[PDB]
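Consortium newsletter contribution from the modelling node. Members have asked for a concrete example of what our holo predictions look like. Here is one, prepared for the zinc ion complex that several groups have been discussing at recent meetings.
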Amino acid sequence: NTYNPFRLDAPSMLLIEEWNQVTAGFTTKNGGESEPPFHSLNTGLHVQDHEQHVINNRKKVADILKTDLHDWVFADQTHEDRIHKVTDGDRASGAFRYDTALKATDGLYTDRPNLFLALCFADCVPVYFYDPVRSLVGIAHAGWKGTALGIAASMVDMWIRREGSNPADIRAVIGPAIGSCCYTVDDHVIDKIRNLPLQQEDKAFLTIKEGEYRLELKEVNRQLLVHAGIPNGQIEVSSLCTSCERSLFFSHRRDRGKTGRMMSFIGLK
Ligand SMILES: [Cl-]
Ligand SMILES: [K+]
Ligand SMILES: [Zn+2]
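And here is the predicted structure:
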């Protein structure tokens, strides 16, 4: 299926065209230095890959975007719902060492120029946020936990309440993540999903058999953005499934737990 709203600058980059001034995108599996099981453009420092290879994969992505890795900010992602407003002082945090990545953080946004925000992915849902009026860019990492927590709606509530955004001005993109085609969950997950402040929670999951459910994590997040006040017309959901697209993405589910991570990135220049 189409890459839309992304454009493929092969091999390594998928770029959100309409936003580019914002630079936003998502990396692919290809064009890196990492050995199996991280072949080849692994960007995670937390998956026991060779550290120098990950920094070089990041150094290559930073150079394609004609930026410096010193102006990048990374998160210690704990699959909760903490959103950090990145400022100049946060520069280079987590970019070369995981020790300085933003602790227990899964949402990032900023209004400062030349400051690139970065989240790691290999099946979970990447969300992008852009307010062209307030000149805010943001990204959030939503697995099933972050989805049940509504980390995507908190980004919108944070822009509305702390930053003075009009929710009608906010644009959002949902990137490559695991589709319902390849994702089944137990009651423990579904009970937490169906407890979201959405009334149409069950539109995103079905029952295969008792205790096994198919779940579309992109759709719950899209529902949470519309609930939060973003007009549905201003949300674009990538159809790409990280499990299905074997030549493009790492997938935690397909690869049986030991694999690389792509990254989403956004920044203003
Ligand atoms: Cl439970
Ligand atoms: K249903
Ligand atoms: Zn799939």
